[PDB]
Design a binder for these strands. Sequence first.
RNA 1: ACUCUGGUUUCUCUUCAGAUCGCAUAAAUCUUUCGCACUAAAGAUUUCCGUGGAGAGGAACAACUCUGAGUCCAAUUUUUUGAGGCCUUGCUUUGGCAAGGCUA
Length: 54
Amino acid sequence: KSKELHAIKERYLKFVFEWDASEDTSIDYNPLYKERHQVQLLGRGFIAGIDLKQ
RNA sequence: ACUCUGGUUUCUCUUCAGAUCGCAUAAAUCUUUCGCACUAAAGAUUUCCGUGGAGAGGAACAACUCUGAGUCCAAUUUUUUGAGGCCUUGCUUUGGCAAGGCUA
Protein backbone atom coordinates (compact mmCIF):
# COMPACT_ATOMS: atom_id res chain seq x y z
CA LYS A 1 0.00 0.00 0.00
CA SER A 2 2.57 2.60 1.10
CA LYS A 3 5.22 1.28 -1.26
CA GLU A 4 2.45 1.12 -3.86
CA LEU A 5 1.76 4.84 -3.51
CA HIS A 6 5.47 5.67 -3.35
CA ALA A 7 6.10 3.80 -6.60
CA ILE A 8 3.19 5.65 -8.21
CA LYS A 9 4.55 9.01 -7.04
CA GLU A 10 8.09 8.21 -8.18
CA ARG A 11 6.90 7.09 -11.62
CA TYR A 12 4.69 10.14 -12.19
CA LEU A 13 6.88 12.80 -10.54
CA LYS A 14 39.47 -1.81 -4.43
CA PHE A 15 39.08 -5.31 -5.89
CA VAL A 16 35.49 -6.37 -5.17
CA PHE A 17 35.46 -10.10 -5.84
CA GLU A 18 31.86 -10.55 -4.67
CA TRP A 19 28.98 -8.59 -6.18
CA ASP A 20 27.46 -5.86 -4.04
CA ALA A 21 24.01 -6.86 -2.79
CA SER A 22 22.80 -3.34 -3.62
CA GLU A 23 22.76 -4.42 -7.28
CA ASP A 24 19.99 -6.94 -6.57
CA THR A 25 16.65 -6.71 -8.36
CA SER A 26 13.28 -8.40 -7.62
CA ILE A 27 12.83 -6.31 -4.43
CA ASP A 28 9.23 -5.67 -5.43
CA TYR A 29 6.08 -4.60 -3.57
CA ASN A 30 3.35 -6.36 -5.56
CA PRO A 31 2.67 -9.77 -3.94
CA LEU A 32 2.00 -11.25 -7.39
CA TYR A 33 5.60 -10.48 -8.42
CA LYS A 34 7.09 -11.92 -5.21
CA GLU A 35 5.07 -15.07 -4.47
CA ARG A 36 5.07 -16.35 -8.03
CA HIS A 37 3.08 -19.53 -8.56
CA GLN A 38 5.54 -22.36 -9.15
CA VAL A 39 5.18 -24.52 -12.25
CA GLN A 40 4.20 -28.07 -11.33
CA LEU A 41 4.65 -29.57 -14.83
CA LEU A 42 1.69 -31.91 -14.25
CA GLY A 43 3.60 -33.25 -11.25
CA ARG A 44 5.90 -35.19 -13.57
CA GLY A 45 8.46 -32.64 -14.78
CA PHE A 46 11.21 -31.42 -12.47
CA ILE A 47 13.72 -28.59 -12.32
CA ALA A 48 17.29 -29.40 -13.32
CA GLY A 49 20.02 -29.79 -10.71
CA ILE A 50 18.02 -29.89 -7.48
CA ASP A 51 17.67 -33.29 -5.79
CA LEU A 52 14.68 -35.24 -7.10
CA LYS A 53 13.49 -36.48 -3.70
CA GLN A 54 13.27 -32.88 -2.46
C1' A B 1 11.98 -58.08 -64.81
C1' C B 2 18.44 -56.79 -68.39
C1' U B 3 22.86 -52.98 -68.77
C1' C B 4 26.26 -47.61 -67.64
C1' U B 5 27.44 -43.43 -64.10
C1' G B 6 27.89 -41.56 -59.35
C1' G B 7 31.01 -44.01 -53.83
C1' U B 8 32.88 -43.76 -48.87
C1' U B 9 37.09 -42.63 -45.82
C1' U B 10 41.73 -39.98 -45.02
C1' C B 11 45.95 -36.18 -45.85
C1' U B 12 47.29 -31.63 -48.24
C1' C B 13 46.50 -27.14 -51.21
C1' U B 14 43.41 -22.85 -53.51
C1' U B 15 39.24 -19.59 -53.41
C1' C B 16 34.44 -17.53 -51.65
C1' A B 17 31.52 -17.02 -47.48
C1' G B 18 27.17 -10.80 -42.98
C1' A B 19 25.03 -17.91 -43.08
C1' U B 20 23.20 -18.70 -35.09
C1' C B 21 29.52 -18.81 -41.04
C1' G B 22 30.01 -20.55 -34.01
C1' C B 23 22.28 -23.34 -30.93
C1' A B 24 29.38 -20.85 -28.53
C1' U B 25 31.53 -16.32 -27.45
C1' A B 26 37.61 -13.87 -26.15
C1' A B 27 41.37 -9.78 -26.54
C1' A B 28 43.53 -5.22 -28.51
C1' U B 29 43.13 -0.30 -30.89
C1' C B 30 40.42 4.24 -32.30
C1' U B 31 36.15 7.47 -31.79
C1' U B 32 31.74 9.26 -28.97
C1' U B 33 28.96 9.48 -24.65
C1' C B 34 28.47 10.70 -19.94
C1' G B 35 30.76 9.54 -15.27
C1' C B 36 34.94 11.45 -11.81
C1' A B 37 35.86 3.44 -16.87
C1' C B 38 37.37 -4.09 -14.52
C1' U B 39 33.52 -2.95 -11.37
C1' A B 40 30.15 1.45 -18.41
C1' A B 41 27.41 1.95 -22.76
C1' A B 42 27.49 3.02 -28.23
C1' G B 43 30.03 2.86 -33.22
C1' A B 44 34.18 1.21 -36.16
C1' U B 45 38.75 -1.53 -37.18
C1' U B 46 42.08 -5.44 -36.09
C1' U B 47 43.95 -10.11 -34.03
C1' C B 48 42.95 -14.67 -32.13
C1' C B 49 40.19 -19.65 -30.87
C1' G B 50 37.64 -22.85 -35.68
C1' U B 51 34.09 -23.47 -39.33
C1' G B 52 31.02 -24.20 -43.98
C1' G B 53 30.68 -24.16 -49.81
C1' A B 54 33.27 -25.03 -54.22
C1' G B 55 37.59 -26.49 -56.79
C1' A B 56 42.48 -29.17 -57.12
C1' G B 57 46.02 -32.92 -55.79
C1' G B 58 47.60 -37.22 -52.92
C1' A B 59 46.12 -42.51 -50.83
C1' A B 60 42.71 -46.66 -48.36
C1' C B 61 38.83 -50.12 -49.59
C1' A B 62 33.66 -50.89 -51.74
C1' A B 63 32.10 -51.41 -55.99
C1' C B 64 25.74 -51.44 -58.08
C1' U B 65 21.58 -51.09 -51.73
C1' C B 66 20.56 -46.22 -52.96
C1' U B 67 20.33 -41.62 -56.67
C1' G B 68 19.34 -42.03 -61.71
C1' A B 69 19.61 -43.21 -66.72
C1' G B 70 19.76 -46.53 -70.98
C1' U B 71 15.76 -50.77 -71.27
C1' C B 72 -3.76 -61.21 -67.39
C1' C B 73 -9.29 -57.26 -71.80
C1' A B 74 -14.70 -61.06 -77.94
C1' A B 75 -21.33 -60.76 -75.52
C1' U B 76 -24.03 -52.69 -74.32
C1' U B 77 -19.00 -47.89 -72.27
C1' U B 78 -14.75 -47.44 -76.65
C1' U B 79 -10.19 -52.42 -79.73
C1' U B 80 -13.25 -58.37 -82.00
C1' U B 81 -19.19 -54.76 -85.55
C1' G B 82 -25.25 -53.62 -87.65
C1' A B 83 -22.14 -54.22 -91.20
C1' G B 84 -23.95 -54.00 -96.41
C1' G B 85 -27.65 -53.71 -100.71
C1' C B 86 -32.15 -50.32 -103.69
C1' C B 87 -34.23 -45.28 -105.54
C1' U B 88 -33.90 -39.34 -106.99
C1' U B 89 -31.55 -34.77 -107.91
C1' G B 90 -26.60 -31.09 -108.97
C1' C B 91 -22.08 -32.16 -111.03
C1' U B 92 -20.08 -36.36 -113.72
C1' U B 93 -12.82 -36.13 -112.43
C1' U B 94 -18.63 -41.29 -116.64
C1' G B 95 -14.73 -43.80 -111.34
C1' G B 96 -18.68 -41.93 -108.89
C1' C B 97 -19.07 -37.80 -105.05
C1' A B 98 -23.04 -34.78 -101.86
C1' A B 99 -28.04 -34.82 -99.50
C1' G B 100 -32.53 -37.23 -98.81
C1' G B 101 -35.88 -41.46 -99.21
C1' C B 102 -35.43 -46.58 -98.25
C1' U B 103 -34.53 -52.64 -97.47
C1' A B 104 -32.10 -55.38 -94.28
